[PDB]
Design a protein around this ligand. Structure first.
Ligand code: BHC
Ligand code: BHC
Ligand code: BHC
Lengths: 293, 291
C-alpha cells in the first residue's frame, strides 16, 4: 500500500483503516497559534479567541473524521510549548469558549464527542471568580456530553506532573479498597476514564512533547510540524497517518546476515558519513527557531 | 556565540558551560547497536557483548567529560526501540557486563560515577537464576560506586510504566509518615536518588522517546540521530549541545507587532511553503526520516 494510493483514498476507507490499525489515541496540542494569528489574520479587526476556536474545531473535526477514537489536547500548563496565551486571564477566556461556545457545543454533538478534562486545574486554576466559573463549566461539559460515545476528547489544564496526583489517588484507593489501584484504575482516576497509551503525538517547532502523563510509550510515534498547528491540512494529516500506519512498523524486519556486500555498503553509506546528522538540531532566524532539514 | 566558535572551544570550556547552563540531566539510550555491529564489525570474529560494552564506555565517557552530571540510559524493557538484544538471555549477558566487567568498573572508578538502576527489574528479572544473579550484581554495583560524587548513571531495566510502583511507594510512604510523599520523595523513591527533570533526550531513527518516568517535560529537548547511537562523534554531541544551550531557548522573543510587511511576508512564506519532521520512508525494511 503506497503513499499516493493512501492519499487517493476516500475519507471513509481511511477512517476504517485507522479504526483497525490506529492511531487509536492521538496527542495534539495547538501550538504557535499566536504566530499563526499574526500571519493569517488581521489582529486589528479579528477576534483572537474566536479565530483560534474555529481552527480548534476544524482540526478536532478532521482528526475524528479520520477515525481517531481519542484525542488528547494539552490546552494550558507551565510546560506547554508555544502556548496560546501568555497570561492566564486570556487562557481562561479560551477555556470558557471550549466549554460554552455554541459552535463547539454543536461540534461535540454532531460528532458524538464526550469531553473530559485532566490535570491539576481544580486546585491550580485562579482562586478567582473567573476560574471558579471555568471549573464549573468543565464539570458541566463533561456531564452534558456524557451520552456521546463515538469519540473522546481530553483537554489538559495543568496536565503536567501527575506524580503527586497519582500518589494521593493511590493512597485514597488503598484506604477505600484495601489494595493498591491497578494501572488501569490509576489512568481512570487521572483522566476520568480509561484511555489507552498514545499512538502518536503531533507537535510543532522545537522537538518536545508534554502533558500526556501515563499515556506515553516508545510505541508513541512522534511528529513535529514545521508550520504552527492551525496550518494543518488534510494532506499533512494523511502523510502523518500513512507514516504511522505503514512505515513505523514495517514488516518483515531486515535480516542483515542475508545482505550482500553491496547491500551492507549501501546501508553503511546512509548511516556513515555524511555526516553527523541529527534531527532536532536547528537554527534561529529573527528570534525564531527552525529545525534544520 | 556561534556554532563554529562553540565547536572550536576547548573541551574544558564546553564542559564549564554545560555545568552551569545545562543539560544537567541527559537521556541517551543506545539504540540500533545491532545494525552498527553488523555494519562496522565482523560477527564471525568479534564478540558482540564486548564490542557493544566498549562503545557504551566511549559514549558515556564522552557525555560525562562534556560536563553532563546525570545520564539516564534505558537498557532493557518492553517499549525500547531498536534494543540491543531480542532475547533476555543475551540482554542479561549485557547487564551482567555493566555490573561486573573490569573495563567498566574501571570507568566508573576513574570518572567518579555513581551507578543506579531503576524500573521493575527486581520483580520481572529473577524468574531465573541468571536474573537473580544480575539483580544482586546491580545492588552490589550501586553500593560499591556509592562514594563517587561527580556523576550519576541510571540504567533502565523495565523502566517504563512507573504508575503502579509510584502507587505502592506512596501507600507505603503514607503508612509510615502519615502524609503523602512529595514529588521529590517519589522521584527519590523510584530512582534511588532525587534527579532533576531531563533536559534532553537523544534517540535514533524513528522519532520516539521512552523509559525515563517522572523526568520528562516540555522543556526536555529531543533529538534523533540518523545513525545508530554508537556512531556518535564529538562533533554530533557538540551540535546537539549547542542547539540546546543557545537555540532552543533563544532570547529575546520576537515581537510580531514590530515587524515590517516584508518581515511578516518572509516568515509567512516559510510556513506556507507542507513539511513534518517525523514522516519517513522505508528502504529494505528500514525506516529513515525524510529531510
Ligand atoms: O511568552 C510567551 O507566551 C511567548 C511565547 C511562549 O509560548 O512562551 C512564544 C513562543 O511561541 O515560544 C512567543 C513566540 O512566538 O516566539 C512569544 C512572542 O510573541 O514572541 C511569546 C510572547 O508572548 O512574548
Ligand atoms: O507484531 C508484529 O507486528 C510482528 C510481526 C507481524 O508482522 O505481525 C512479525 C512478523 O512479521 O511475523 C514479527 C516477526 O519477526 O516474526 C514480529 C517480531 O519481531 O516478533 C512482530 C512483533 O514485533 O511483534
Ligand atoms: O526483534 C528484534 O529485536 C529486532 C528489532 C527490534 O528492536 O525490535 C529491530 C529493530 O531495530 O527494530 C530489528 C531491526 O534492525 O530492524 C531487527 C532486525 O534484525 O531486523 C530485530 C530482529 O532481531 O529481527
Amino acid at each position: 500500500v503506497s503513499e499516493k494510493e493512501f492519499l487517493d483514498l476516500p475519507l471513509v476507507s481511511v477512517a476504517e483503516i485507522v479504526r483497525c490499525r490506529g492511531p487509536k489515541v492521538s496527542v495534539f496540542p495547538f501550538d504557535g497559534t499566536r504566530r499563526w494569528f499574526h500571519l493569517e489574520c488581521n489582529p486589528q479587526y479579528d477576534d483572537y479567541q474566536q479565530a483560534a476556536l474555529r481552527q480548534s474545531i476544524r482540526i478536532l473535526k478532521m482528526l475524528f473524521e479520520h477515525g481517531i477514537e481519542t484525542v488528547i489536547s494539552p490546552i494550558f500548563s507551565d510546560d506547554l510549548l508555544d502556548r496560546g496565551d501568555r497570561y492566564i486571564v486570556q487562557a481562561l477566556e479560551g477555556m470558557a469558549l471550549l466549554a460554552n461556545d455554541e459552535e463547539i457545543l454543536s461540534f461535540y454533538k454532531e460528532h458524538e464527542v464526550h469531553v473530559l478534562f485532566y490535570g491539576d486545574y481544580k486546585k491550580r486554576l485562579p482562586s478567582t471568580a473567573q476560574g471558579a466559573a471555568v471549573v464549573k463549566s468543565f464539570d458541566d461539559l463533561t456531564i452534558s456530553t456524557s451520552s456521546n460515545t463515538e469519540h473522546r476528547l481530553c483537554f489538559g489544564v495543568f496536565g503536567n506532573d501527575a506524580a503527586e496526583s497519582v500518589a494521593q489517588f493511590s493512597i485514597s484507593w488503598n484506604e477505600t479498597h484495601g489494595k493498591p489501584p491497578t494501572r488501569r484504575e490509576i489512568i481512570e482516576g487521572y483522566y476520568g476514564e480509561y484511555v489507552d497509551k498514545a499512538d502518536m503525538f503531533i507537535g510543532f517547532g522545537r522537538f518536545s512533547t508534554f502533558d500526556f502523563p501515563l499515556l506515553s510509550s516508545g510505541k508513541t510515534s512522534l511528529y513535529f510540524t514545521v508550520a504552527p498547528s492551525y496550518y494543518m491540512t488534510e494532506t499533512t494529516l494523511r502523510r502523518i497517518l500513512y507514516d504511522h500506519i505503514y512505515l513505523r512498523h514495517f514488516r518483515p524486519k531486515p535480516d542483515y546476515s542475508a545482505m550482500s556486500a553491496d547491500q551492507l555498503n549501501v546501508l553503511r553509506n546512509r548511516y556513515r558519513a555524511q555526516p553527523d546528522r541529527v534531527f532536532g538540531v536547528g537554527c534561529v532566524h529573527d528570534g525564531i527557531w527552525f529545525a534544520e532539514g
